[PDB]
């Protein structure tokens, strides 16, 4: 419960699903790059980290920035990965 907090979570997606439904994206008026969670799966890999809620910001994945990434590109950036998804997540809680 602090601002400026980042969690680098490493997950292995279970049959093509970490467990987050993506929203936001550069196409929306976000911080010029970032995908965000709209919905958490109850007990996929993502929720099994669980420091996420339905508010947080994905800034980078596998060390790969969501720079210029929109809905489709953000999926591609999470989905077409080398199994391990190191999610660089920022707080969905404002200062």
């Amino acid at each position: 419960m602090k601002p400026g907090d980042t969690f680098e979570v490493e997950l292995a997606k279970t049959d093509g699903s970490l467990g987050i439904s993506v929203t936001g994206g550069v196409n929306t008026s976000v911080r010029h790059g970032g995908i965000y969670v709209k919905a958490i799966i109850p007990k996929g890999a993502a929720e099994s980290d669980g420091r996420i809620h339905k508010g947080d910001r994905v800034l980078a994945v596998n060390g790969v920035s969501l720079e210029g990434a929109t809905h489709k590109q953000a999926v591609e950036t999470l989905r077409n990965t080398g199994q391990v998804v190191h999610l660089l997540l920022e707080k969905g809680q404002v200062p």
Binding site: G16, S21, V22, V75, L78
Partner: peptide, 6 residues
């Protein structure tokens, strides 16, 4: 589209 489980 939005909201894609991945």
């Amino acid at each position: 589209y939005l909201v894609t489980s991945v």
